[PDB]
Amino acid sequence: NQLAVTFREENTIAFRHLFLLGYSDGADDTFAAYTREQLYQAIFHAVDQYLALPDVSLGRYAYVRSGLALCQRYYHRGHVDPANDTFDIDPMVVTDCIQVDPPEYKNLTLKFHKLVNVTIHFRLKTINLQSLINNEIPDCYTFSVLITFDNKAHSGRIPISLETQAHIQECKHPSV
Amino acid sequence: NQLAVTFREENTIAFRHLFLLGYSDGADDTFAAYTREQLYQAIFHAVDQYLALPDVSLGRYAYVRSGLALCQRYYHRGHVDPANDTFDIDPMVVTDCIQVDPPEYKNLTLKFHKLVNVTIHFRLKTINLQSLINNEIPDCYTFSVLITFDNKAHSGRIPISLETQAHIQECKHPSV
Amino acid sequence: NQLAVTFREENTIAFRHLFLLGYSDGADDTFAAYTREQLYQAIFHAVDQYLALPDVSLGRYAYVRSGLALCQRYYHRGHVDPANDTFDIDPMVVTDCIQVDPPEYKNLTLKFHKLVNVTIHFRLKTINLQSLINNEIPDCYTFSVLITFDNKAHSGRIPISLETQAHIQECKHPSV
Amino acid sequence: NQLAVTFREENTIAFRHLFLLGYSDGADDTFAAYTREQLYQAIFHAVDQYLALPDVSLGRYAYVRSGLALCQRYYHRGHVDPANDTFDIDPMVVTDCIQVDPPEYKNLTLKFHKLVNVTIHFRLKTINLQSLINNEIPDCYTFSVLITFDNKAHSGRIPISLETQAHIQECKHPSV
Numbered sequence: 001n002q003l004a005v006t007f008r009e010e011n012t013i014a015f016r017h018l019f020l021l022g023y024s025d026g027a028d029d030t031f032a033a034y035t036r037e038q039l040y041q042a043i044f045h046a047v048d049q050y051l052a053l054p055d056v057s058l059g060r061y062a063y064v065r066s067g068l069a070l071c072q073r074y075y076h077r078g079h080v081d082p083a084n085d086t087f088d089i090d091p092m093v094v095t096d097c098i099q100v101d102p103p104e105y106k107n108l109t110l111k112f113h114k115l116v117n118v119t120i121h122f123r124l125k126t127i128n129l130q131s132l133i134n135n136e137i138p139d140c141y142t143f144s145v146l147i148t149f150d151n152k153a154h155s156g157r158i159p160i161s162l163e164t165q166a167h168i169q170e171c172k173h174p175s176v
Numbered sequence: 177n178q179l180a181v182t183f184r185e186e187n188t189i190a191f192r193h194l195f196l197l198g199y200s201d202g203a204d205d206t207f208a209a210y211t212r213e214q215l216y217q218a219i220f221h222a223v224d225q226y227l228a229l230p231d232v233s234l235g236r237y238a239y240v241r242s243g244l245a246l247c248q249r250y251y252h253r254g255h256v257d258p259a260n261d262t263f264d265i266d267p268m269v270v271t272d273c274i275q276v277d278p279p280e281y282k283n284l285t286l287k288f289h290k291l292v293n294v295t296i297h298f299r300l301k302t303i304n305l306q307s308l309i310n311n312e313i314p315d316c317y318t319f320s321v322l323i324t325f326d327n328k329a330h331s332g333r334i335p336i337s338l339e340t341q342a343h344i345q346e347c348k349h350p351s352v
Numbered sequence: 353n354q355l356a357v358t359f360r361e362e363n364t365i366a367f368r369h370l371f372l373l374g375y376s377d378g379a380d381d382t383f384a385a386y387t388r389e390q391l392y393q394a395i396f397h398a399v400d401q402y403l404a405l406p407d408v409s410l411g412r413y414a415y416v417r418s419g420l421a422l423c424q425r426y427y428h429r430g431h432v433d434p435a436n437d438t439f440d441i442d443p444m445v446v447t448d449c450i451q452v453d454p455p456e457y458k459n460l461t462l463k464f465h466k467l468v469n470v471t472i473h474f475r476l477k478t479i480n481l482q483s484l485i486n487n488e489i490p491d492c493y494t495f496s497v498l499i500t501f502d503n504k505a506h507s508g509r510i511p512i513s514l515e516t517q518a519h520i521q522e523c524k525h526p527s528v
Numbered sequence: 529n530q531l532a533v534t535f536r537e538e539n540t541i542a543f544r545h546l547f548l549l550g551y552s553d554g555a556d557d558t559f560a561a562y563t564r565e566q567l568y569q570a571i572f573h574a575v576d577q578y579l580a581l582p583d584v585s586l587g588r589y590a591y592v593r594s595g596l597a598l599c600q601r602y603y604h605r606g607h608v609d610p611a612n613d614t615f616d617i618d619p620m621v622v623t624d625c626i627q628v629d630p631p632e633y634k635n636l637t638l639k640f641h642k643l644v645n646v647t648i649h650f651r652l653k654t655i656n657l658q659s660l661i662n663n664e665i666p667d668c669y670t671f672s673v674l675i676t677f678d679n680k681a682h683s684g685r686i687p688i689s690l691e692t693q694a695h696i697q698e699c700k701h702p703s704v
Contacts (some may be wrong), residue, residue, distance in 0.1 A: 262703075478684075
């Protein structure tokens with residue numbers, strides 16, 4: 001089991017290196033963007049990487065399906081004018097997504113003045129071959145990847161995180 | 177409150193990344209310049225960034241007003257000649273500032289031989305939108321930013337720091 | 353003795369800097385590859401360095417003999433198809449090596465879909481001159497270097513490590 | 529006093545950044561060279577920096593006098609042949625120095641096969657202006673800088689260190 005806990009954590013760590021531009025171990029809770037170009041770059045790197053996955057990954061990952069949802073969230077209405085010290089805000093959070101299908105989004109225009117966050121969602125399928133070592137049959141994993149560029153604090157600093165969730169089932173038909 | 181303590185600290189952290197050339201988390205008490213070009217570069221980066229703020233920041237900051245004071249301080253009289261082992265000094269500290277107005281200083285010439293320090297001062301206005309999450313009304317923050325290139329130790333090493341101070345009041349007229 | 357423990361550890365540390373592309377102290381247990389080009393690069397750097405050893409090393413190392421074994425290991429049979437949720441695997445591990453003789457492998461093609469690991473093996477001979485300080489006679493060391501690109505976890509992350517083993521004997525004929 | 533302990537340590541820290549190529553805080557006990565080009569580069573950087581000191585330093589340092597001694601040390605006789613497992617060594621350590629006078633060594637050819645170490649020695653004069661803050665009269669410091677590329681362990685790894693020693697006296701004639 002814990003060798004499978006390590007399988008989820010190992011795969012997630014790999015995802016951070018693969019999809020998080022400029023990521024390096026130990027940076028998890030300080031990793032963040034501070035400029036618009038930094039943020040656009042991080043977003044485009046994560047999607048491009050997703051699209052190049054078959055050619056660059058050291059793991060054999062399979063796409064699931066639309067494949068990737070690039071979503072930005074912002075206030076339905078956001079007039080923020082710190083200069084004349086006022087604002088007119090409608091707190092309802094609106095979601096705008098761009099679907100990306102692997103068999104191929106850069107026109108993306110973020111509404112920085114009232115941005116709540118940006119998320120990139122997608123799933124990846126992989127076989128836990130390691131199980132073969134213990135003479136067991138490999139599990140069929142489905143990873144749910146969630147990359148978040150959180151701006152909920154509206155503090156000029158946008159922390160970036162990558163989390164996952166694994167769905168373990170039994171592969172259709174194995175052969176060992 | 178502490179979520180507002182975090183609002184001041186989060187904004188300050190963002191300022192360190194935005195205005196401190198080559199800055200990275202964890203470097204706070206060792207961050208420093210050691211060469212003249214390093215120092216000129218740090219100074220010009222902080223001002224250029226200040227001027228580009230509207231186009232590069234992930235936060236919606238407003239200028240306040242002159243906007244930025246680039247000041248160097250040096251001894252009224254400073255003949256330092258370690259070679260012939262003497263010096264003639266008048267300890268009175270003279271301040272020379274260059275005002276920078278956003279709607280636009282590189283001729284700056286530092287008096288290295290008797291430099292006491294260089295400071296960059298400016299204020300930024302921002303709304304604490306986060307307060308909307310707790311169903312409260314957003315505060316109107318005025319950040320006072322102070323970047324110091326301290327040479328008071330005259331030790332060949334010039335530590336660089338960025339500190340801030342927040343003035344919290346109530347925005348003119350809000351709308352939620 | 354412990355000064356000889358330090359001789360083995362010092363030499364090994366040097367090997368990590370010499371043969372591990374992008375290596376830096378303190379990275380030992382997180383050091384890894386995540387892309388195919390990263391892995392090919394690490395492998396080619398270690399071999400090229402090995403071949404350039406006489407011209408770049410600060411230590412006087414001697415080749416031993418074939419000199420270097422660049423081996424990749426993979427499952428005898430590996431059809432991994434996470435997309436259609438199946439696999440057909442023959443767990444027997446097959447080893448394919450490429451011998452490299454110093455008096456000179458880039459056509460290498462890794463079988464990523466069923467890669468178990470890659471290893472680079474070679475020996476280096478060196479004299480422990482340090483022993484001269486204590487007025488003793490220098491030992492004759494034979495270092496066995498093993499660079500492993502371990503993919504046994506099939507988790508998208510390939511940790512890279514460099515270990516050694518020393519064979520201490522008495523040099524043929526010394527002169528001090 | 530301790531503010532003067534800090535004056536010596538602050539100046540030394542500055543020297544590490546100024547003269548040690550690729551140096552960064554916290555690297556003190558792992559800082560080292562591993563290749564011949566790395567070592568030649570470190571050596572030439574330290575001398576070039578020394579020569580450019582007046583134009584690049586943030587401190588007002590004065591040369592003392594020849595100014596810089598670039599010395600390499602090696603065994604009087606060193607035939608090291610790990611391949612045919614023998615050696616013929618005369619442990620007497622020979623010193624070969626190149627004097628560098630500021631009013632201006634790259635032909636340097638290190639005897640890597642029997643190198644004991646390389647050292648760079650020079651003195652710098654500076655006034656402790658800080659003393660003016662406490663209303664005291666500034667001391668006249670003479671820093672003795674010693675950069676060592678130690679190969680005494682003959683282990684393929686050459687640790688590099690920079691140490692100093694301060695001679696405090698009273699400046700000829702001060703004026704405050």
